[PDB]
């Protein structure tokens, strides 16, 4: 139904080595399509999805250039931010950027965004209205004014509500196969005798996509959130995702518990039982 | 595609 394109940029300074380590990765929904690693022998924007490899030299020159430009801007930003925050040149630091666009069911522009971060914390972000910003601190407001004086917000404002959406809709259209697919969760339950009077019921959900899933544990039809565990949706390393949901129940009462699996891949909320 | 031609340095 809903979709997005997001770019993740990570730049880390390396006191003593040549340049900083720069890593940029492009995402559409939950599947990476481009990467750039300054430490790679390539020094080029590289493809990570088969549906971006369709784009030609013009594209890759532009992305390599833009991303190198991003790298430069970040290399310079590392120095800048280091100065903004007055930090040792012997210390390793991290700038992270994320920006992208969300589309509705009709692919009409929903929302856009541009988040920027230093050493793992929010630095500056483009507001909902795509006209304001975010003064996380003075360093940020410096950048903010530096930006809205440069009319940066309008640049993104056009790119987000326009360019990135257009490209998203382009990737969605060129990546229908893998972007618009829904791999149903491979649900199944496991019974581990945690002890004598208890047994762990683990509700597995394997090889689903997108990662967006809802595992629930009901007991006697009524939802249950106590004694229930749930691991972060992990990648299988092949595009699909894993995610189990355990629960500790008194022996014999296992049938009393049901696992409610919800996913865009399956039209009807699955209910699991047994063990 | 990537924002361009670039930042917009901090």
């Amino acid at each position: 139904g809903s979709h997005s394109m997001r770019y993740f940029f990570t730049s880390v300074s390396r006191p003593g080595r040549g340049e900083p380590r720069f890593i940029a990765v492009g995402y559409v929904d939950d599947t990476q399509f481009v990467r750039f690693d300054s430490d790679a022998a390539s020094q080029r924007m590289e493809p990570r999805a088969p549906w971006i490899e369709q784009e030609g030299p013009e594209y890759w020159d532009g992305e390599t250039r833009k991303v190198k430009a991003h790298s430069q801007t970040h290399r310079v930003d590392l120095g800048t931010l280091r100065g903004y925050y007055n930090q040792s040149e012997a210390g390793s630091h991290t700038v992270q950027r994320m920006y992208g666009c969300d589309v509705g069911s009709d692919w009409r522009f929903l929302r856009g965004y541009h988040q920027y971060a230093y050493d793992g914390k929010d630095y500056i972000a483009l507001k909902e209205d795509l006209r304001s910003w975010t003064a996380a601190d003075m360093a940020a407001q410096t950048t903010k004014h530096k930006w809205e004086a440069a009319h940066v917000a309008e640049q993104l404002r056009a790119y987000l509500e326009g360019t990135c959406v257009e490209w998203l809709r382009r990737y969605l259209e060129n990546g229908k196969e893998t972007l618009q697919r829904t791999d149903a969760p491979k649900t199944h339950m496991t019974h581990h005798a945690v002890s004598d009077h208890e047994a762990t019921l683990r509700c597995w959900a394997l090889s689903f996509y997108p990662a967006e899933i809802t595992l629930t544990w009901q007991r006697d039809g009524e939802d249950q959130t106590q004694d229930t565990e749930l691991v972060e949706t992990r990648p299988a390393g092949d595009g699909t995702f894993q995610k189990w949901a355990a629960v500790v129940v008194p022996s014999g009462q296992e049938q009393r518990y049901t696992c409610h699996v919800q996913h865009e891949g399956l039209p009807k909320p699955l209910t699991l039982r047994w063990e | 595609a990537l924002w361009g031609p670039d930042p917009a340095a901090a």
Partner: T-cell receptor
Amino acid sequence: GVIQSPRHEVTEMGQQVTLRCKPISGHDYLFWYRQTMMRGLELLIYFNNNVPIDDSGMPEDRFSAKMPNASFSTLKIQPSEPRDSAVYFCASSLWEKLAKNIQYFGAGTRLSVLE
Amino acid sequence: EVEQDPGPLSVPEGAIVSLNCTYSNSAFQYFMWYRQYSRKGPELLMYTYSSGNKEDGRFTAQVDKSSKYISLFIRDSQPSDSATYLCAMRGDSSYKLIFGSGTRLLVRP
């Protein structure tokens, strides 16, 4: 402003010609443009902090651009050819101005390479 | 690439003049008009972020992304004006500016 040297270069072909440019202090974008007689500007190469961002305009062979430092760029031409005869503009700018598409040019270098 | 009438074209002082360029390549988001005297560096006149009209003094910059057709209107041609006018443009990817080969202009006093 943007300082280019020489203002005029009359040199026999086959000899290295060194076009030298000093961008406006602070400007991190250095553009090299060639303007053959009666043509518009052709961007040869532009740097962003000493590194060649878009060298898609460089004629390949003979033309060697570089920015050893931020306040000096060298556009060298080995076996200079008469065809090189043109007005090489060095341009300089910042991101903020570049967003409005403002560039600042030099007086250019009237290069005449003779046979 | 962009095409532009090089023709020197002479106009009598006080006349309206139309300069324009056509370009074979979308993506070009930014469209601007440079003015150039003799061999001196080019100076920007007009800059339109995208399709639409732009009224500045005796000058009017118009951009028709549909027609890939940029234009610059000058009213009451003043003494100066006489010069080569270059249309530039670019977008997204790079700052590599692309210029029209130029339009010489002579406004007769």
